[PDB]
Amino acid sequence: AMEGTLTATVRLATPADAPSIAKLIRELADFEELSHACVVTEEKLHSSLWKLPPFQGPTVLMLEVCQQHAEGEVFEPIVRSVVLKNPIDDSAREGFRSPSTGTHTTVGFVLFFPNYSTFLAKGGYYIEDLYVRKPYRGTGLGTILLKSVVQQAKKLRAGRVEWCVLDWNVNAIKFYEGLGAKVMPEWRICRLTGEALEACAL
Amino acid sequence: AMEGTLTATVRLATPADAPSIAKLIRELADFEELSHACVVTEEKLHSSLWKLPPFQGPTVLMLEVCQQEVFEPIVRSVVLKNPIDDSAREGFRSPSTGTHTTVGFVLFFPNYSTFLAKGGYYIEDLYVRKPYRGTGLGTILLKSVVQQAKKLRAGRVEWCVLDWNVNAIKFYEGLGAKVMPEWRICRLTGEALEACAL
Numbered sequence: 278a279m280e281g282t283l284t285a286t287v288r289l290a291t292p293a294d295a296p297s298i299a300k301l302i303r304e305l306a307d308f309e310e311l312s313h314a315c316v317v318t319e320e321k322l323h324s325s326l327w328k329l330p331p332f333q334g335p336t337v338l339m340l341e342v343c344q345q346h347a348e349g350e351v352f353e354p355i356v357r358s359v360v361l362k363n364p365i366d367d368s369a370r371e372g373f374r375s376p377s378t379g380t381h382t383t384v385g386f387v388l389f390f391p392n393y394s395t396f397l398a399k400g401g402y403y404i405e406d407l408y409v410r411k412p413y414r415g416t417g418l419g420t421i422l423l424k425s426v427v428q429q430a431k432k433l434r435a436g437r438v439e440w441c442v443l444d445w446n447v448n449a450i451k452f453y454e455g456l457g458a459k460v461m462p463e464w465r466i467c468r469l470t471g472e473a474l475e476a477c478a479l
Numbered sequence: 480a481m482e483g484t485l486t487a488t489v490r491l492a493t494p495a496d497a498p499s500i501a502k503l504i505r506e507l508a509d510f511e512e513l514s515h516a517c518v519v520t521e522e523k524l525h526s527s528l529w530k531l532p533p534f535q536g537p538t539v540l541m542l543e544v545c546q547q548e549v550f551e552p553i554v555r556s557v558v559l560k561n562p563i564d565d566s567a568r569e570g571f572r573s574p575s576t577g578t579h580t581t582v583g584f585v586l587f588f589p590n591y592s593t594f595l596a597k598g599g600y601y602i603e604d605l606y607v608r609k610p611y612r613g614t615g616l617g618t619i620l621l622k623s624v625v626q627q628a629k630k631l632r633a634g635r636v637e638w639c640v641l642d643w644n645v646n647a648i649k650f651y652e653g654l655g656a657k658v659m660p661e662w663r664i665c666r667l668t669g670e671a672l673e674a675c676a677l
């Protein structure tokens with residue numbers, strides 16, 4: 278069991294992280310009660326990610342823990358000390374060994390990509406997924422991961438940082454509101470997919 | 480002014496379209512009851528758009544009409560539901576062809592679904608000028624984006640709508656889109672974004 282103080286690391290994901298990303302996307306879909314809709318594979322991540330420079334297309338940041346630079350680098354890892362709220366019991370620890378450092382455990386991820394506001398006439402960032410494994414929630418790790426994205430977005434002069442939440446996901450809403458984000462009740466998401474997308478033609 | 484059949488053209492916007500795009504973004508913001516929050520300028524569009532290849536970043540397609548390649552223009556004949564009276568006609572002359580009137584625009588950019596593990600497209604803005612609504616022009620414009628998204632193997636085409644905008648909701652549902660009531664947009668901007676530190 279992990280006790281006392283942890284060292285938390287937020288770093289750019291590499292193709293070697295595809296197995297862990299696939300497992301975390303599946304855990305998130307299971308949390309959102311959307312397992313049937315989730316068809317992610319390591320192969321699909323290799324086909325679609327790591328094609329464009331980081332922050333110029335879909336980009337993943339990995340969150341990892343362990344028991345406690347030159348010019349023009351894209352993303353220097355963010356390293357923070359975290360005093361544990363309670364000791365952590367992680368039965369999944371061995372299946373989440375980090376490919377960057379063997380002594381690190383992968384505990385979360387975030388996927389984000391550029392968006393654009395016409396009212397601001399400025400580019401922003403959109404966060405697609407934000408996920409922390411169950412034994413590591415409530416001790417400040419999700420705050421470090423979200424704030425690392427926001428800090429990068431601000432460095433890139435983002436007008437806004439946006440994302441979506443399920444109306445029933447009260448713990449995430451409280452978490453986002455506590456960081457200054459506003460839940461906008463007036464907007465609804467529209468999706469054109471599957472057969473309806475196939476049928477949509479001129 | 481305009482009666483019978485129109486020729487509708489959907490084409491890629493160039494920097495010469497920044498004045499009309501700015502004008503149309505303002506009309507949309509006014510429709511969406513968000514005028515005060517709209518700070519678009521031609522200069523801001525020149526700084527943020529036309530920086531990346533089309534469909535690889537924020538991309539605009541213009542919608543233009545007249546009385547009857549990365550992206551080949553889409554040309555369609557449109558039988559007018561009712562004759563059109565356009566008092567703003569002279570302020571919306573097309574920079575591509577002088578005989579064409581700019582009546583709308585769409586802005587879209589790539590998005591990504593982790594559940595599909597596939598890229599898609601997100602439509603930021605979709606707008607048609609009031610005299611040209613309800614006669615099939617908006618359908619042509621949205622379908623032009625979807626056709627390009629499908630050619631680029633998009634898993635989904637997504638956008639958002641105000642819950643009170645029943646005319647856009649009906650239009651979207653009629654095209655096969657599903658309005659998903661469970662999702663809420665969260666935004667970190669302004670002072671809240673500036674105060675967010677690590």
Ligand SMILES: CC(C)(COP(=O)(O)OP(=O)(O)OC[C@H]1O[C@@H](n2cnc3c(N)ncnc32)[C@H](O)[C@@H]1OP(=O)(O)O)[C@@H](O)C(=O)NCCC(=O)NCCS
Nearest residue numbers: 362408409414415416417418419420441442449451452455
């Ligand atoms: C939402 C999620 C990412 C947040 O991450 P977390 O690691 O659980 O978050 P934190 O621990 O930083 O913050 C959660 C709470 O703990 C509190 N907290 C942080 N450090 C703490 C500490 N050392 N001691 C006590 N409380 C602490 C924060 O103040 C926050 O409280 P609030 O929610 O009342 O503001 C995480 O719970 C998760 O993965 N959930 C399942 C998936 C999900 O909901 N995804 C959202 C996608 S839209």
Ligand SMILES: CC(C)(COP(=O)(O)OP(=O)(O)OC[C@H]1O[C@@H](n2cnc3c(N)ncnc32)[C@H](O)[C@@H]1OP(=O)(O)O)[C@@H](O)C(=O)NCCC(=O)NCCS
Nearest residue numbers: 560606607612613614615616617618639640647649650653
């Ligand atoms: C929403 C908007 C983009 C749609 O464009 P439009 O040009 O009005 O759209 P169309 O004319 O293709 O479709 C509207 C309706 O007219 C009908 N229609 C189209 N051509 C027709 C014709 N020749 N004869 C009779 N009816 C016709 C369509 O079937 C559709 O009906 P439905 O709403 O019951 O499905 C437009 O009205 C607009 O700009 N509105 C204000 C801004 C706004 O709401 N933007 C959305 C931001 S999310």
Ligand SMILES: N[C@@H](CCCC[NH3+])C(=O)O
Nearest residue numbers: 394395396397603604639
């Ligand atoms: N373009 C608007 C959002 C409209 C979303 C619905 N089409 C903005 O920048 O705030």
Ligand SMILES: N[C@@H](CCCC[NH3+])C(=O)O
Nearest residue numbers: 405406441592593594595
């Ligand atoms: N990643 C999910 C959507 C989750 C949105 C909220 N984080 C999908 O591809 O459908």
Ligand code: NA
Nearest residue numbers: 442443446449
């Ligand atoms: Na959610």
Ligand code: NA
Nearest residue numbers: 640641644647
């Ligand atoms: Na709307």
